[PDB]
Amino acid sequence: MKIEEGKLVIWINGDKGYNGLAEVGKKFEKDTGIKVTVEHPDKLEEKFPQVAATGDGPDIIFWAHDRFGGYAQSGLLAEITPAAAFQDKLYPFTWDAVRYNGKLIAYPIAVEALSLIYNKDLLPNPPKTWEEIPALDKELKAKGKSALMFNLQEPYFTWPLIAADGGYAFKYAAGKYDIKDVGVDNAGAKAGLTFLVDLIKNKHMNADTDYSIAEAAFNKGETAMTINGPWAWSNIDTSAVNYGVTVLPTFKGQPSKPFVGVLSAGINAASPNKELAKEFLENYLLTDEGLEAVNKDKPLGAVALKSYEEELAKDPRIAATMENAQKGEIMPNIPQMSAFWYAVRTAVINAASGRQTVDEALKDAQTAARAFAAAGKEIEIKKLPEFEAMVNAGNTTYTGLVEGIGYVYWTTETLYFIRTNPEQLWAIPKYQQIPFPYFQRKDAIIETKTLHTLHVLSKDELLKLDYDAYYAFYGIVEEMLKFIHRADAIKSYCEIPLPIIKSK
Amino acid sequence: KIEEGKLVIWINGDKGYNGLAEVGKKFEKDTGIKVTVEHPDKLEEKFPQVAATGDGPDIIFWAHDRFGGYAQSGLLAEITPAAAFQDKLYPFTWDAVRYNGKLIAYPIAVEALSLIYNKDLLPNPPKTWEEIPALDKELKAKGKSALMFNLQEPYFTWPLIAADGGYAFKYAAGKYDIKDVGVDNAGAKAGLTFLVDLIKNKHMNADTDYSIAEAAFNKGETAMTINGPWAWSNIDTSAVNYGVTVLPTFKGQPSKPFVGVLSAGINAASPNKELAKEFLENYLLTDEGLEAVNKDKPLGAVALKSYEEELAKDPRIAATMENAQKGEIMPNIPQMSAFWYAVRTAVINAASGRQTVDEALKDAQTAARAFAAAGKEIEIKKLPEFEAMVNAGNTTYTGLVEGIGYVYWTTETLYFIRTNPEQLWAIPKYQQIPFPYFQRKDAIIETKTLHTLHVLSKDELLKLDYDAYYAFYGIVEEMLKFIHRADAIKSYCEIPLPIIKSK
Amino acid sequence: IGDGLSLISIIDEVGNGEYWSAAGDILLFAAGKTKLSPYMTVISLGTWMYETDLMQWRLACINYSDYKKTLIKYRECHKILNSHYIEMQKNLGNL
Amino acid sequence: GDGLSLISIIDEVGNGEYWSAAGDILLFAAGKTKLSPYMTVISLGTWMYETDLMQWRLACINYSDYKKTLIKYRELQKKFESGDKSVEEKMNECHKILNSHYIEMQKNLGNL
């Protein structure tokens, strides 16, 4: 189904309760006459940005909130402002996940985050703090078992401990991320990573444990605790382990802070049915009976609607997901998170192995995250000869980091010239540059050349620059250079005052 | 994309492509470089599309007038023949391949209309237009007519209209002035007046078109026609004994046909420019080169003096060159579309008596100026359809709009700050901020793109100082951006900018 | 100055929310309004220039530049110099 | 000339000599497509380095912040003199904010 006025097409992933959502669409039809078509296309999160521009996307798209940042950056999602009472039905932190540069661009549906998963038979009383884990491991090691095994390779799993006392990826304030405020090398992250590394040095954990290793050990009854999300529950069910899910341990009295992913409902900017979409979502889906229909089909986990979450939370596994989510941090929806994952992944590996101190590892990662974040939305570094081969070929397309010198970017300006020898047809043209307004008598022959000027910034220089997640800093620089060129040139060309009409 | 070390040549299918290919084999034989000759359909429209993507042939052959648009888009390499080489070609042919002062192709061949006459009916064709009325009296008494040629298309009637002072766009030193149109001057009126009187006095029918005149001449029913070398083949087949000669004079001055100059241009994206230079200058533009092409299909008159002198032993070719030298090089600016569109209506209305010569040329002068100023595309859009565009936020159209004149758009980006970032459950509110825009990093910044509509009456548009080579709207936009920013930055901060002026 | 279509503006980015002028006193546009009046356009941009005014400026500047160039000679052609200045007021008086 | 910054590339290759605005310097000729930092600066006429620009924005922002804080101070001053007696401590606070901004401004202007 393509978008058609007077009806709704919804895209949602195949692993969600689409049948249940279809029932909600049928109640919407029966009450209002508006047909609702629920589709679960393959690769729908990548199809959407490709076709939404050409107006062949859905009215509504369900996906993880952090993907919606790119959609919103391209203007593909309708901005919503639901009524005060409607917003108050949902947990405030979930609304933060669907803000993009201050604008609400979707509706929160469900919530997921990591929790502490524990073996009740081995560990009836799971620890409330990380600090008691060493001692717990001594007791369990004397039984031929261990306290804790989780994926140490991926910062998604290790960052909850690291952030507990103050680490963060990018500072969030009022629906906006500041990519100039990275929290990778502050005192909180160092304390948390130091505790993570000491667990490894004192042999309570092994530096090479990954997702597969931890999963097998816990489901086989060999470790008392793992850290994982709701997607892992099914495999534990199949195993013989009597397991609980609970709040993650504190560190220095501070909650562990896992990243929070919010399933969210976005409205296509090109939809002619915006009001029908808001009506469907606010009065039919985001209600006890709406979410129940979906949950009944395939479980949503913890949900953003307070009244129905209190129903689901009678399951303590779901209550723990919501609690860790409320104590965690919203996954930033900006693509510069790529810089965060790349830098931090290396820091944990090097600190864990003793290649670097915790202090120097996070120092390096703080700097690396800053630079890649300033340089662009994804990790790309170019070898210097390979870049100089671009420049000497006249190729000015690359902007970003180049190994050895830092960041490169281009500003553009057009030069005008007048032919000085137009009567000499049997000769090489000679030209002379002319100032900004450029106006010459009609018989003059005017030639223009386009000038791409290369800029080189060291990483340190780059960081003092006003880089931003939402707007490229180089844009204003180019307009600044073009303006001052103009202002100087026009006084050179003609000092008669311009006939400017000035308002008010 | 264009393969290095090899030459790909595009030339039209009606030209001597096989002969050109054998000049290529001479080129391969000497240098080892293969030369491939292609004649794709509508190559003159394919070329801009594929050259822009850095693809296409290394060399394109076509009439010089089409190359003006190519050079406007930077699609043609600027060529550099030596001074002595240029004297091997007729000087006026080099004018045909200058664009805005730049030599951008090599002249190859020359075509223009001539007077074609039946030797049996008319051994001694008239030298003046003025003597054709009397000639028609005589031939009518023998059951014939003096003259039949296509009166529907201004290409064929323009030689008469221009003879006493008409021109399309004034030429001077490699540059056309699209503000200087010679359609309603006294010369153009005199010539067209003479055309319409021929029709009123029954010496010609205003409905006569190309196929009618062609049939009449090739059947022996009229003594003369005005046509070009593309028409000789059909006359050859008909077995009429025809001569080709200089067009008649009007008011003592020669008729001024448009001259098309077949030309070889080098693709700006070609990696093989010198190879292409070597081919054109050292193999093609020689007696032995042109002859090889000629033998396949005749080039007509040629730009190379040496080979033209051999060809001109044919008086038909000598006449084509003579009419070409006395004529007007076809202007290579794409705004010629305005000239053809306007002048076509004027001649037809005047010829049919629906309009006087004066009003028809006065109106065509105005329409040609207005359409040329508006752009390459002959389009006038009706006001409701344009307003339908505006009310949809569709800002793509630039050009004439019926009833209001010329429309164009200028663009500015607005920045705003959110004054409302922490207000509870509220409609976001914004306030515009001036040009540098730099705010604290906690501020929320929002940008809008603003397309402002401009309206010029035809009469306003005609007073502006623009040219064919640079759209005046572009500099207008940069002025508006400059003054917007000059005023804003004073509002943003009075601290002097750390500007480095070295020069 | 307020003709049917001149100086109306089109905004590409539709969004909720009120967009207020620089000084805070005029509401330029809100509520997903995407077409500005000529009056709102002039306030948003702050400055404007008419192409016909730019052309008199352009003529005056050329005439002035010519009189400066033909001056350095005599500063080492009256009718030229005075011809140039006369054409210059002719434009300036039309500003 | 710090080694690779301020070089320029010209898109349009062409023969012919392109001279500076004054007519004394040959910017490029004979199909040169790459200018040195020296020509770039001559053809462009004016320049600004990013680092100096950033100190300029800090100067302007801090000055803007000091003017705004001072407008609020006068509004509190109106209240105070008119009997409104609640604003006295927002007035003290508003004041040390005012000077912090001024000191930042001078630190920024000093860097220029």
Defining traits:
heterotetramer; A: alpha+beta; D-Maltodextrin-Binding Protein, domain 2; 3 domains; seven-stranded mixed beta sheet; five-stranded mixed beta sheet; C: 95 residues; alpha+beta; two-stranded antiparallel ribbon; two-stranded antiparallel sheet; 5 strands; 49% helix; rod-shaped
Report on this model:
The complex is a heterotetramer, with two copies of chain A and two copies of chain C. Chain A is of the alpha+beta class. Chain A folds into three domains: 8-112 and 260-330, D-Maltodextrin-Binding Protein, domain 2, CATH 3.40.190; 115-257 and 335-375, Periplasmic binding protein-like II (D-Maltodextrin-Binding Protein, domain 2), CATH 3.40.190; 381-493, no CATH class. Chain A is built from 19 helices and 23 strands. In chain A, strands 1, 2, 3, 6, 15, 16 and 17 form a seven-stranded mixed sheet that branches. In chain A, helix 1 (18-32) runs antiparallel to helix 12, helix 7 (155-163) packs across helix 8 (187-201) and helix 15 (337-352) runs antiparallel to helix 16. Chain C has 95 residues and is α+β, with helices and mostly antiparallel strands. Chain C has two domains: 9-45, no CATH class; 51-92, no CATH class. Helices cover 49% and strands 14% of the residues of chain C. In chain C, the strands form two sheets. Chain C has a two-stranded antiparallel sheet with strand order 1-4. Chain C has a two-stranded antiparallel sheet with strand order 2-3. Chain C is rod-shaped. Chain C starts with 8 loop residues before the first strand and ends with a helix. Chains A and B meet through helix 19 of A and strand 10, strand 22 and helix 19 of B. Strand 22 of chain A pairs antiparallel with strand 1 (8-10) of chain D, so a sheet runs across the interface. The PDB classes it as antitoxin. Keywords: antibacterial toxin, antitoxin.
